[PDB]
Write a protein that binds this ligand. Structure first.
Ligand SMILES: [Ca+2]
Ligand code: NA
Length: 259
């Protein structure tokens, strides 16, 4: 069932990167797995550097946690930052030094669609507060695929658009009043965008909400712990109903509760 976020659990570390290449990154599972993948399949991208192309794929959670990848994909174009997601068999990622979102079908290693996010800032215009070229952040929730960004028209306030997952068309767009550069990251649960106050503090909070169904913005004070003091990626997985994050080399997951 769906509801408002009311609680976040303690971060649990599932894997720790062993080199500086993985100081920041993105790891994820597919909330709508398709053959040959399952809900155990995990993908990991270590995103430090300027030619990020390697995507580590693990058939089993045990392999993700303790072993080597079962497959490495080499993306056909370098990827930007930590905002990518996997949805219904495709990796959705942002091309380096662009506002282009790319749909890369994992089982065939084929680019199926590319879309400029209209008006979106990129490459350090509207990052989250830590920087990292985090201008464009994809998200999956119970209703499918979204993108979080900003524009000059929005004066840097978070904008979110629902995306067609097949062709990347924008279906609907909402504008919040939350300065994107003022929050550490964001994610969407049940159609509500939530933000995190700090990427360094052990005593951060989920501090704002914007409900796309009602247009209402709220403040919140839900505790959120950055166990390792540098969270570069915070996303929601609607199948597991958990937050997935990357915090200073560590791939972590948080339980949640909804009303
Ligand atoms: Ca996010
Ligand atoms: Na994302």
């Amino acid at each position: 069932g769906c509801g408002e976020l009311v609680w976040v659990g303690e971060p649990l570390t599932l894997r720790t990167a062993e080199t500086i290449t993985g100081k920041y990154g993105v790891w994820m599972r597919d909330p709508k797995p398709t053959y040959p993948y399952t809900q155990e399949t995990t993908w990991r991208i270590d995103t430090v550097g300027k030619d990020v192309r390697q995507v580590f794929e693990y058939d089993l959670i045990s392999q993700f946690m303790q072993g080597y990848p079962s497959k490495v994909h080499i993306l056909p174009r370098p990827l930007e930052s930590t905002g990518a997601v996997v949805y219904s068999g495709s990796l959705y990622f942002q091309g380096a030094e662009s506002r282009t979102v790319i749909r890369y079908e994992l089982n065939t290693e084929t680019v199926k669609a590319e879309k400029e996010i209209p008006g979106a800032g990129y490459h350090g215009q509207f990052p989250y507060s830590w920087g990292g070229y985090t201008d464009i952040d994809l998200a999956v929730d119970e209703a499918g695929l979204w993108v979080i960004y900003s524009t000059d028209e929005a004066k840097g306030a978070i904008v979110l658009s629902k995306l067609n997952p097949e062709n990347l068309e924008l279906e609907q767009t909402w504008e919040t009043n939350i300065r994107k550069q003022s929050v550490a990251n964001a994610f969407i649960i049940c159609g509500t965008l939530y933000t995190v106050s700090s990427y360094t503090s052990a005593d951060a909070t989920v501090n704002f909400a914007y409900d796309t169904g009602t247009g209402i913005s709220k403040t919140l004070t839900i505790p959120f712990k950055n166990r390792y003091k540098y969270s570069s990626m915070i996303d929601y997985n609607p199948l597991e109903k958990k937050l997935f994050a990357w915090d200073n080399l560590n791939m972590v997951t948080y339980d949640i509760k909804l009303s």
